[PDB]
CSV table of C-alpha atoms (C1' of nucleotides) and ligand atoms in Angstrom, one decimal:
chain,number,residue,atom,x,y,z
A,1,UNK,CA,-100.3,160.8,-74.0
A,2,UNK,CA,-99.0,160.7,-77.3
A,3,UNK,CA,-100.3,160.8,-80.8
A,4,UNK,CA,-97.9,158.6,-82.2
A,5,UNK,CA,-100.4,156.1,-81.8
A,6,UNK,CA,-103.0,153.1,-79.8
A,7,UNK,CA,-100.5,151.6,-77.8
A,8,UNK,CA,-100.0,148.2,-77.4
A,9,UNK,CA,-97.9,145.2,-76.0
A,10,UNK,CA,-95.5,145.1,-79.0
A,11,UNK,CA,-93.4,147.9,-77.4
A,12,UNK,CA,-93.5,146.6,-74.1
A,13,UNK,CA,-95.2,147.8,-71.0
A,14,UNK,CA,-95.3,151.6,-70.7
A,15,UNK,CA,-94.5,153.5,-67.7
A,16,UNK,CA,-92.4,156.6,-67.0
A,17,UNK,CA,-91.6,156.7,-63.1
A,18,UNK,CA,-88.2,155.6,-63.7
A,19,UNK,CA,-87.5,158.2,-66.1
A,20,UNK,CA,-88.4,159.1,-69.9
A,21,UNK,CA,-87.4,161.3,-72.5
A,22,UNK,CA,-87.6,161.9,-76.2
A,23,UNK,CA,-84.2,160.0,-76.8
A,24,UNK,CA,-81.5,158.4,-75.5
A,25,UNK,CA,-79.5,161.6,-75.1
A,26,UNK,CA,-82.0,163.3,-72.7
A,27,UNK,CA,-81.8,160.1,-70.4
A,28,UNK,CA,-78.0,160.7,-70.2
A,29,UNK,CA,-79.1,164.3,-69.4
A,30,UNK,CA,-81.4,163.4,-66.6
A,31,UNK,CA,-79.2,160.5,-65.3
A,32,UNK,CA,-76.2,162.8,-64.8
A,33,UNK,CA,-78.3,165.4,-63.1
A,34,UNK,CA,-79.9,162.7,-60.7
A,35,UNK,CA,-76.4,161.1,-59.7
A,36,UNK,CA,-74.2,164.1,-59.8
A,37,UNK,CA,-71.4,162.9,-62.5
A,38,UNK,CA,-71.1,163.4,-66.2
A,39,UNK,CA,-69.5,161.5,-68.6
A,40,UNK,CA,-67.8,157.6,-68.4
A,41,UNK,CA,-69.4,157.1,-64.6
A,42,UNK,CA,-72.8,156.7,-66.5
A,43,UNK,CA,-73.6,154.1,-69.0
A,44,UNK,CA,-77.0,153.2,-70.8
A,45,UNK,CA,-77.7,150.2,-72.6
A,46,UNK,CA,-80.6,150.1,-75.2
A,47,UNK,CA,-82.5,146.8,-74.8
A,48,UNK,CA,-85.0,146.1,-77.6
A,49,UNK,CA,-88.4,144.2,-76.4
A,50,UNK,CA,-89.3,141.3,-78.4
A,51,UNK,CA,-92.2,139.7,-76.3
A,52,UNK,CA,-90.5,136.0,-76.7
A,53,UNK,CA,-89.5,134.7,-73.8
A,54,UNK,CA,-85.7,132.9,-73.3
A,55,UNK,CA,-86.1,129.9,-71.4
A,56,UNK,CA,-84.6,126.6,-71.2
A,57,UNK,CA,-86.3,123.1,-72.5
A,58,UNK,CA,-87.7,122.7,-69.1
A,59,UNK,CA,-89.3,126.2,-69.1
A,60,UNK,CA,-86.5,127.6,-66.4
A,61,UNK,CA,-84.5,131.0,-66.7
A,62,UNK,CA,-81.5,131.2,-69.1
A,63,UNK,CA,-79.6,134.4,-70.3
A,64,UNK,CA,-78.4,135.1,-73.5
A,65,UNK,CA,-76.4,138.1,-73.2
A,66,UNK,CA,-74.7,139.5,-69.8
A,67,UNK,CA,-74.4,143.0,-69.0
A,68,UNK,CA,-71.5,143.3,-66.7
A,69,UNK,CA,-69.7,146.2,-65.2
A,70,UNK,CA,-67.2,147.4,-67.8
A,71,UNK,CA,-64.7,149.3,-65.4
A,72,UNK,CA,-64.4,150.7,-61.8
A,73,UNK,CA,-65.0,153.9,-63.7
A,74,UNK,CA,-68.6,153.1,-64.5
A,75,UNK,CA,-70.7,153.9,-61.6
A,76,UNK,CA,-74.2,153.7,-62.9
A,77,UNK,CA,-76.0,151.2,-65.4
A,78,UNK,CA,-79.1,152.3,-67.3
A,79,UNK,CA,-81.1,150.1,-69.6
A,80,UNK,CA,-83.5,151.9,-71.8
A,81,UNK,CA,-86.0,150.6,-74.4
A,82,UNK,CA,-87.0,153.0,-77.0
A,83,UNK,CA,-90.6,152.5,-77.8
A,84,UNK,CA,-90.8,150.9,-81.4
A,85,UNK,CA,-92.4,153.9,-83.6
A,86,UNK,CA,-92.7,156.8,-81.1
A,87,UNK,CA,-91.1,160.3,-81.6
A,88,UNK,CA,-93.0,161.7,-78.5
A,89,UNK,CA,-91.6,163.0,-75.5
A,90,UNK,CA,-91.6,159.9,-73.7
A,91,UNK,CA,-90.3,157.7,-76.6
A,92,UNK,CA,-87.1,156.3,-74.6
A,93,UNK,CA,-88.2,155.0,-71.1
A,94,UNK,CA,-85.7,153.6,-68.6
A,95,UNK,CA,-86.5,149.9,-67.4
A,96,UNK,CA,-83.7,149.3,-65.0
A,97,UNK,CA,-80.9,151.3,-62.9
A,98,UNK,CA,-78.1,149.8,-61.5
A,99,UNK,CA,-76.0,151.5,-58.9
A,100,UNK,CA,-72.8,149.3,-58.8
A,101,UNK,CA,-71.4,150.7,-55.5
A,102,UNK,CA,-74.7,151.0,-53.7
A,103,UNK,CA,-74.0,150.2,-49.9
A,104,UNK,CA,-70.6,150.4,-48.4
A,105,UNK,CA,-68.7,147.1,-49.0
A,106,UNK,CA,-68.0,146.4,-44.9
A,107,UNK,CA,-71.6,146.4,-44.6
A,108,UNK,CA,-72.3,144.2,-47.6
A,109,UNK,CA,-69.7,141.8,-46.1
A,110,UNK,CA,-71.4,141.8,-42.7
A,111,UNK,CA,-74.7,141.4,-43.9
A,112,UNK,CA,-73.9,138.3,-46.1
A,113,UNK,CA,-72.5,137.0,-42.5
A,114,UNK,CA,-75.2,137.8,-40.6
A,115,UNK,CA,-78.2,137.1,-42.8
A,116,UNK,CA,-76.9,133.7,-43.7
A,117,UNK,CA,-76.2,132.5,-40.3
A,118,UNK,CA,-79.5,133.9,-39.1
A,119,UNK,CA,-81.6,132.7,-41.7
A,120,UNK,CA,-80.2,129.2,-42.1
A,121,UNK,CA,-80.4,128.7,-38.6
A,122,UNK,CA,-83.9,130.4,-37.8
A,123,UNK,CA,-85.6,131.3,-41.1
A,124,UNK,CA,-89.0,130.5,-42.1
A,125,UNK,CA,-89.1,129.7,-45.5
A,126,UNK,CA,-91.5,131.2,-47.7
A,127,UNK,CA,-93.2,129.4,-50.6
A,128,UNK,CA,-93.6,131.2,-53.9
A,129,UNK,CA,-95.1,130.1,-57.2
A,130,UNK,CA,-91.9,131.2,-59.0
A,131,UNK,CA,-89.5,129.1,-57.1
A,132,UNK,CA,-90.9,126.4,-59.7
A,133,UNK,CA,-91.0,126.1,-63.6
A,134,UNK,CA,-94.8,125.8,-65.1
A,135,UNK,CA,-95.1,122.3,-65.0
A,136,UNK,CA,-93.7,122.7,-61.3
A,137,UNK,CA,-91.4,119.5,-61.8
A,138,UNK,CA,-88.0,121.2,-62.0
A,139,UNK,CA,-85.5,121.2,-59.2
A,140,UNK,CA,-83.8,124.6,-59.6
A,141,UNK,CA,-83.7,125.1,-56.1
A,142,UNK,CA,-81.6,121.9,-55.3
A,143,UNK,CA,-83.2,118.9,-53.7
A,144,UNK,CA,-81.4,118.6,-50.3
A,145,UNK,CA,-84.1,120.4,-47.8
A,146,UNK,CA,-81.4,121.8,-45.6
A,147,UNK,CA,-79.4,123.3,-48.0
A,148,UNK,CA,-82.0,124.1,-51.3
A,149,UNK,CA,-82.3,127.6,-52.3
A,150,UNK,CA,-85.1,129.6,-50.3
A,151,UNK,CA,-86.8,132.9,-50.0
A,152,UNK,CA,-87.8,134.8,-46.5
A,153,UNK,CA,-90.1,137.6,-46.8
A,154,UNK,CA,-90.4,139.8,-44.0
A,155,UNK,CA,-92.4,143.2,-43.2
A,156,UNK,CA,-95.9,143.7,-44.3
A,157,UNK,CA,-97.6,141.8,-47.3
A,158,UNK,CA,-100.9,142.6,-48.9
A,159,UNK,CA,-103.5,139.7,-48.4
A,160,UNK,CA,-106.7,138.9,-50.3
A,161,UNK,CA,-108.7,137.9,-47.6
A,162,UNK,CA,-108.2,141.7,-46.0
A,163,UNK,CA,-107.5,143.5,-49.3
A,164,UNK,CA,-104.7,144.9,-47.0
A,165,UNK,CA,-102.3,144.5,-45.0
A,166,UNK,CA,-102.0,140.8,-43.7
A,167,UNK,CA,-101.4,142.2,-40.1
A,168,UNK,CA,-104.8,143.4,-39.8
A,169,UNK,CA,-106.0,141.0,-37.1
A,170,UNK,CA,-102.6,140.8,-35.3
A,171,UNK,CA,-102.1,142.5,-32.0
A,172,UNK,CA,-98.3,143.2,-31.9
A,173,UNK,CA,-97.1,141.6,-35.5
A,174,UNK,CA,-94.1,140.0,-36.1
A,175,UNK,CA,-92.5,141.8,-39.0
A,176,UNK,CA,-89.5,139.6,-38.8
A,177,UNK,CA,-90.9,136.2,-37.4
A,178,UNK,CA,-88.1,133.5,-37.2
A,179,UNK,CA,-88.6,129.9,-36.0
A,180,UNK,CA,-89.8,129.5,-32.1
A,181,UNK,CA,-89.9,132.4,-30.2
A,182,UNK,CA,-86.3,134.0,-29.8
A,183,UNK,CA,-86.9,137.7,-29.8
A,184,UNK,CA,-83.2,138.6,-29.5
A,185,UNK,CA,-82.6,137.2,-32.7
A,186,UNK,CA,-85.4,138.9,-34.4
A,187,UNK,CA,-84.6,141.9,-33.0
A,188,UNK,CA,-81.0,141.7,-34.7
A,189,UNK,CA,-82.4,140.7,-37.9
A,190,UNK,CA,-85.1,143.6,-37.4
A,191,UNK,CA,-82.3,146.0,-37.1
A,192,UNK,CA,-80.1,145.1,-39.9
A,193,UNK,CA,-82.9,145.2,-42.4
A,194,UNK,CA,-84.2,148.3,-40.9
A,195,UNK,CA,-81.0,149.9,-41.1
A,196,UNK,CA,-80.5,148.6,-44.6
A,197,UNK,CA,-84.0,149.8,-45.5
A,198,UNK,CA,-83.0,153.4,-43.7
A,199,UNK,CA,-79.7,153.3,-46.2
A,200,UNK,CA,-81.3,152.8,-49.2
A,201,UNK,CA,-84.2,155.1,-49.1
A,202,UNK,CA,-82.1,158.2,-50.1
A,203,UNK,CA,-80.4,156.3,-52.9
A,204,UNK,CA,-83.9,155.4,-54.1
A,205,UNK,CA,-85.1,159.3,-53.9
A,206,UNK,CA,-82.0,160.3,-55.6
A,207,UNK,CA,-82.2,158.0,-58.6
A,208,UNK,CA,-85.8,157.4,-59.3
A,209,UNK,CA,-87.5,160.4,-57.6
A,210,UNK,CA,-90.8,159.6,-59.3
A,211,UNK,CA,-91.2,156.2,-58.3
A,212,UNK,CA,-89.8,156.9,-54.6
A,213,UNK,CA,-92.2,159.6,-54.3
A,214,UNK,CA,-95.3,157.6,-55.2
A,215,UNK,CA,-94.3,155.0,-52.3
A,216,UNK,CA,-94.1,157.8,-49.7
A,217,UNK,CA,-97.5,159.4,-50.6
A,218,UNK,CA,-99.0,157.6,-47.9
A,219,UNK,CA,-96.2,157.4,-45.1
A,220,UNK,CA,-98.0,159.3,-42.4
A,221,UNK,CA,-101.1,157.2,-43.1
A,222,UNK,CA,-100.0,153.9,-42.4
A,223,UNK,CA,-96.3,154.0,-40.9
A,224,UNK,CA,-97.1,150.4,-39.1
A,225,UNK,CA,-97.0,149.1,-43.0
A,226,UNK,CA,-93.8,150.7,-43.7
A,227,UNK,CA,-89.9,150.1,-42.7
A,228,UNK,CA,-87.1,152.3,-42.1
A,229,UNK,CA,-86.2,154.5,-39.1
A,230,UNK,CA,-86.2,158.0,-40.8
A,231,UNK,CA,-88.8,160.0,-42.3
A,232,UNK,CA,-89.1,158.8,-46.0
A,233,UNK,CA,-90.3,155.4,-46.1
A,234,UNK,CA,-90.8,154.0,-49.2
A,235,UNK,CA,-90.7,150.2,-48.5
A,236,UNK,CA,-93.2,147.9,-46.9
A,237,UNK,CA,-91.7,144.5,-47.3
A,238,UNK,CA,-88.4,142.9,-47.7
A,239,UNK,CA,-87.7,139.7,-49.2
A,240,UNK,CA,-84.2,137.8,-48.6
A,241,UNK,CA,-83.5,135.4,-51.6
A,242,UNK,CA,-80.3,132.9,-50.8
A,243,UNK,CA,-79.3,131.2,-53.8
A,244,UNK,CA,-83.1,131.4,-54.8
A,245,UNK,CA,-83.8,130.6,-58.8
A,246,UNK,CA,-86.8,132.9,-59.3
A,247,UNK,CA,-88.5,131.7,-62.4
A,248,UNK,CA,-89.9,134.4,-65.2
A,249,UNK,CA,-92.6,136.2,-63.3
A,250,UNK,CA,-94.0,139.8,-62.4
A,251,UNK,CA,-94.4,140.9,-58.8
A,252,UNK,CA,-98.2,141.4,-59.1
A,253,UNK,CA,-99.2,142.4,-55.8
A,254,UNK,CA,-96.6,145.0,-55.8
A,255,UNK,CA,-98.3,148.7,-55.7
A,256,UNK,CA,-98.7,150.4,-59.2
A,257,UNK,CA,-96.1,153.1,-60.6
A,258,UNK,CA,-93.6,151.9,-57.9
A,259,UNK,CA,-90.6,150.1,-58.2
A,260,UNK,CA,-88.4,147.4,-56.2
A,261,UNK,CA,-84.8,147.6,-55.1
A,262,UNK,CA,-82.8,144.7,-55.2
A,263,UNK,CA,-79.5,144.9,-52.8
A,264,UNK,CA,-77.1,142.1,-54.1
A,265,UNK,CA,-74.5,140.5,-51.4
A,266,UNK,CA,-72.2,137.8,-53.0
A,267,UNK,CA,-70.0,134.9,-51.8
A,268,UNK,CA,-66.7,135.7,-50.9
A,269,UNK,CA,-64.8,134.3,-53.7
A,270,UNK,CA,-66.6,136.9,-55.9
A,271,UNK,CA,-66.0,140.1,-54.6
A,272,UNK,CA,-63.0,141.6,-56.8
A,273,UNK,CA,-63.6,143.6,-59.8
A,274,UNK,CA,-61.8,141.2,-62.2
A,275,UNK,CA,-62.9,137.8,-60.6
A,276,UNK,CA,-63.4,134.5,-62.0
A,277,UNK,CA,-66.0,133.1,-59.4
A,278,UNK,CA,-66.6,129.5,-59.6
A,279,UNK,CA,-70.3,130.4,-60.1
A,280,UNK,CA,-72.7,133.2,-60.2
A,281,UNK,CA,-76.1,134.2,-60.5
A,282,UNK,CA,-77.9,136.7,-62.9
A,283,UNK,CA,-80.9,138.8,-63.2
A,284,UNK,CA,-82.7,138.2,-66.3
A,285,UNK,CA,-85.2,140.2,-68.5
A,286,UNK,CA,-86.8,137.3,-70.6
A,287,UNK,CA,-88.4,139.6,-73.3
A,288,UNK,CA,-85.4,141.5,-74.3
A,289,UNK,CA,-82.5,141.2,-76.9
A,290,UNK,CA,-79.6,143.8,-76.9
A,291,UNK,CA,-79.2,146.4,-79.7
A,292,UNK,CA,-76.6,146.5,-82.3
A,293,UNK,CA,-75.2,149.9,-81.1
A,294,UNK,CA,-74.3,151.7,-78.1
A,295,UNK,CA,-75.9,154.5,-76.0
A,296,UNK,CA,-74.8,156.9,-78.6
A,297,UNK,CA,-75.6,154.6,-81.4
A,298,UNK,CA,-72.3,153.3,-82.8
A,299,UNK,CA,-72.0,149.9,-84.1
A,300,UNK,CA,-68.3,149.5,-83.6
A,301,UNK,CA,-68.8,150.7,-79.9
A,302,UNK,CA,-71.2,147.9,-79.2
A,303,UNK,CA,-69.0,145.6,-80.9
A,304,UNK,CA,-66.2,146.3,-78.9
A,305,UNK,CA,-68.1,145.6,-75.6
A,306,UNK,CA,-69.1,142.3,-76.7
A,307,UNK,CA,-65.4,141.5,-77.5
A,308,UNK,CA,-64.3,143.1,-74.1
A,309,UNK,CA,-67.1,141.1,-72.2
A,310,UNK,CA,-68.9,144.5,-70.9
A,311,UNK,CA,-71.5,142.6,-73.0
A,312,UNK,CA,-71.0,138.9,-72.8
A,313,UNK,CA,-72.4,137.0,-75.8
A,314,UNK,CA,-73.4,133.7,-74.2
A,315,UNK,CA,-73.9,130.3,-76.4
A,316,UNK,CA,-76.4,127.5,-76.1
A,317,UNK,CA,-76.0,125.0,-73.3
A,318,UNK,CA,-76.9,121.1,-73.1
A,319,UNK,CA,-77.1,120.2,-69.4
A,320,UNK,CA,-78.4,117.4,-66.9
A,321,UNK,CA,-80.7,118.5,-64.3
A,322,UNK,CA,-83.3,116.8,-62.4
A,323,UNK,CA,-86.9,116.2,-62.7
A,324,UNK,CA,-89.2,115.8,-59.8
A,325,UNK,CA,-91.3,112.5,-60.3
A,326,UNK,CA,-94.4,114.4,-58.7
A,327,UNK,CA,-95.3,117.9,-59.1
A,328,UNK,CA,-95.5,120.1,-56.1
A,329,UNK,CA,-98.8,121.0,-55.1
A,330,UNK,CA,-100.4,124.1,-54.6
A,331,UNK,CA,-101.5,125.3,-51.5
A,332,UNK,CA,-104.9,124.4,-52.6
A,333,UNK,CA,-88.6,110.8,-56.0
A,334,UNK,CA,-86.6,112.6,-59.0
A,335,UNK,CA,-85.2,111.3,-62.2
A,336,UNK,CA,-82.4,113.0,-64.4
A,337,UNK,CA,-83.3,114.6,-67.7
A,338,UNK,CA,-81.4,116.7,-70.4
A,339,UNK,CA,-81.8,120.4,-70.5
A,340,UNK,CA,-81.3,122.4,-73.8
A,341,UNK,CA,-81.4,126.1,-74.6
A,342,UNK,CA,-80.2,125.9,-78.5
A,343,UNK,CA,-83.8,126.8,-79.5
A,344,UNK,CA,-83.5,130.1,-77.6
A,345,UNK,CA,-80.4,130.7,-79.1
A,346,UNK,CA,-81.6,129.8,-82.8
A,347,UNK,CA,-84.1,132.6,-82.8
A,348,UNK,CA,-82.4,136.0,-82.7
A,349,UNK,CA,-85.6,137.4,-81.2
A,350,UNK,CA,-86.2,135.3,-78.5
A,351,UNK,CA,-85.0,137.2,-75.3
A,352,UNK,CA,-82.5,136.9,-72.4
A,353,UNK,CA,-81.0,140.3,-71.6
A,354,UNK,CA,-79.0,139.5,-68.2
A,355,UNK,CA,-77.2,142.0,-65.6
A,356,UNK,CA,-74.5,140.7,-63.3
A,357,UNK,CA,-75.2,142.5,-60.0
A,358,UNK,CA,-72.2,142.6,-57.8
A,359,UNK,CA,-71.6,142.7,-54.2
A,360,UNK,CA,-73.2,145.9,-52.3
A,361,UNK,CA,-74.7,146.9,-56.0
A,362,UNK,CA,-78.2,148.1,-55.6
A,363,UNK,CA,-80.9,147.2,-58.8
A,364,UNK,CA,-83.9,149.4,-59.3
A,365,UNK,CA,-86.7,148.0,-61.7
A,366,UNK,CA,-90.2,148.1,-62.2
A,367,UNK,CA,-90.7,144.3,-61.4
A,368,UNK,CA,-94.7,144.5,-61.1
A,369,UNK,CA,-94.6,145.3,-65.2
A,370,UNK,CA,-91.5,143.8,-66.5
A,371,UNK,CA,-90.9,140.2,-66.5
A,372,UNK,CA,-87.9,139.0,-64.9
A,373,UNK,CA,-85.7,136.3,-63.4
A,374,UNK,CA,-82.8,134.9,-61.6
A,375,UNK,CA,-80.6,131.9,-63.1
A,376,UNK,CA,-80.6,128.8,-61.2
A,377,UNK,CA,-77.1,128.1,-59.2
A,378,UNK,CA,-75.1,125.1,-60.2
A,379,UNK,CA,-74.7,123.9,-56.5
A,380,UNK,CA,-77.4,126.0,-54.1
A,381,UNK,CA,-76.8,126.1,-50.8
A,382,UNK,CA,-78.2,128.8,-48.6
A,383,UNK,CA,-75.9,127.7,-45.6
A,384,UNK,CA,-73.3,129.5,-48.1
A,385,UNK,CA,-75.0,131.1,-50.9
A,386,UNK,CA,-73.3,132.4,-54.1
A,387,UNK,CA,-75.9,135.1,-53.7
A,388,UNK,CA,-78.1,136.9,-51.6
A,389,UNK,CA,-80.6,139.4,-52.7
A,390,UNK,CA,-82.6,141.6,-50.4
A,391,UNK,CA,-85.7,142.7,-52.5
A,392,UNK,CA,-87.6,145.9,-51.1
A,393,UNK,CA,-90.9,146.8,-52.2
A,394,UNK,CA,-94.5,148.0,-51.4
A,395,UNK,CA,-97.5,145.9,-51.9
A,396,UNK,CA,-100.7,147.3,-53.4
A,397,UNK,CA,-103.5,148.6,-50.6
A,398,UNK,CA,-100.7,148.9,-48.0
A,399,UNK,CA,-102.2,152.7,-46.7
A,400,UNK,CA,-104.4,152.1,-44.0
A,401,UNK,CA,-103.2,152.8,-40.5
A,402,UNK,CA,-102.4,149.9,-38.1
A,403,UNK,CA,-102.2,147.7,-40.9
A,404,UNK,CA,-105.9,148.2,-41.8
A,405,UNK,CA,-107.1,146.9,-38.1
A,406,UNK,CA,-109.9,149.7,-38.1
A,407,UNK,CA,-111.2,148.8,-41.2
A,408,UNK,CA,-111.4,144.9,-40.4
A,409,UNK,CA,-112.8,145.4,-37.1
A,410,UNK,CA,-115.7,147.7,-38.8
A,411,UNK,CA,-115.9,145.0,-41.6
A,412,UNK,CA,-116.5,142.0,-39.4
A,413,UNK,CA,-119.0,144.8,-37.7
A,414,UNK,CA,-121.3,144.2,-40.2
A,415,UNK,CA,-123.2,141.1,-38.9
A,416,UNK,CA,-126.7,140.2,-38.9
B,1,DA,C1',-113.5,132.7,-67.8
B,2,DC,C1',-110.4,130.7,-64.3
B,3,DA,C1',-106.2,128.4,-61.6
B,4,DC,C1',-103.6,130.6,-58.3
B,5,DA,C1',-100.9,133.3,-54.6
B,6,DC,C1',-93.1,137.2,-50.7
B,7,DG,C1',-101.0,134.1,-44.8
B,8,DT,C1',-102.6,134.7,-39.8
B,9,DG,C1',-105.7,134.0,-36.0
B,10,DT,C1',-109.1,131.2,-34.4
B,11,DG,C1',-110.8,126.6,-32.1
C,1,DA,C1',-99.9,119.0,-34.6
C,2,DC,C1',-104.5,119.8,-36.9
C,3,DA,C1',-109.4,122.5,-39.5
C,4,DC,C1',-111.4,126.5,-40.6
C,5,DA,C1',-112.7,131.4,-41.8
C,6,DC,C1',-111.6,135.8,-44.7
C,7,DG,C1',-111.9,136.3,-50.2
C,8,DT,C1',-108.3,140.0,-54.9
C,9,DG,C1',-106.6,140.7,-59.4
C,10,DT,C1',-103.7,139.4,-63.1
C,11,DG,C1',-102.2,136.9,-67.2
C,12,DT,C1',-104.2,133.7,-70.5
D,501,OGA,O1,-83.1,138.8,-56.6
D,501,OGA,C1,-83.4,139.2,-57.9
D,501,OGA,O2,-82.5,139.8,-58.5
D,501,OGA,C2,-84.6,139.2,-58.1
D,501,OGA,N1,-85.7,138.6,-57.3
D,501,OGA,C3,-87.0,138.6,-57.4
D,501,OGA,O3,-87.4,139.0,-58.3
D,501,OGA,C4,-88.1,138.0,-56.5
D,501,OGA,O4,-87.8,137.2,-55.5
D,501,OGA,O5,-89.1,138.4,-56.4
D,502,FE2,FE1,-89.6,139.5,-58.5
D,503,ZN,ZN1,-86.5,125.6,-62.5
D,504,ZN,ZN1,-95.3,158.5,-78.7
D,505,ZN,ZN1,-98.8,145.9,-42.1
DNA sequence: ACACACGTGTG
DNA sequence: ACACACGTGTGT
């Protein structure tokens, strides 16, 4: 759409549905309008796309810079990318929005408790490729099967076998299936996530209207493939991640021109603004580094944030981890090894920009397009997790009524 | 190209 | 508890 000219990967994935404008100043104007507040309440960080991925010696997620909530006065964090070379009307795009005070703290406290107890006792683990490094030998979730970090997926999901909702053949699908057949437990679980899906829809509409609008386009066509209890239902699936290390990946089944909302819950020792948690999980963009200047282009302003901790400049580590003796085999013992990261820290252009999302916060990013990851916990324990994330998304080709049951019957009706 | 996947209902 | 049928996109 611009004659800056064409457009490549050197500048990063291009999209505007989280927001775009000719300069950082214009982004503040958009965000102040959406959020209803001007000034210190909104924080914008410029991040530079380098295309060079930060990872450990074993190929597992690491951070290099941590963007942390600067003060209780900061309500909304915005990460932006100024696209290299562009002077057009979409020169600066929004790649992540973080609402610090996303849901009520009393609900976050209760969801932390309810989801942990329900899922550890009744949850069916969902196997995902991003649970493992590329060599598939790492142990970032932990090795105790009773306690290891894990991911549980609910709602509707896309299926290559139907090119549509996996529930195409299910009379009365179970969107929140738990081990056994305890309907009362599944209904409680369902009610919590349906309620939360209902609470977050308006927050999504408010802060990322274009993305939100794309996700409700076929709401009245495929309502069986949407969550939520009130008009305006952008979400289709929800995944709960309990101390789960999501290795660098993109959410490739996600619908184009959408986004994912991540609601973070944290263990009880990490719920005060100025607190030293024994551990914490971070959300990382491994292809980005931080700028030398703040939102307004001041070097000293950026240096003040570095020494204040609002941007935590991390340093290299050398730790001992476990490596599986055999890789985990695909759908189709252990030994100790050193894991380093000096190499990611020696190159200033190897990326690793992390945010530290708080209890009850809401994170919005286009996970289909941006490589993203979560850091492994020191002692993962899904029975008492350091962090729970609830990832709300809509997969592609989820626009048929009744989970696509009509097209499937019509499909098999092409018979001989 | 081509290995791989936030699966489920049949029998 | 198993086997089998159904078959898409992407990043590289
Ligand atoms: O929990 C987070 O912050 C990110 N989670 C994911 O990217 C995922 O499970 O696909
Ligand atoms: Fe993801
Ligand atoms: Zn790993
Ligand atoms: Zn341009
Ligand atoms: Zn469905």
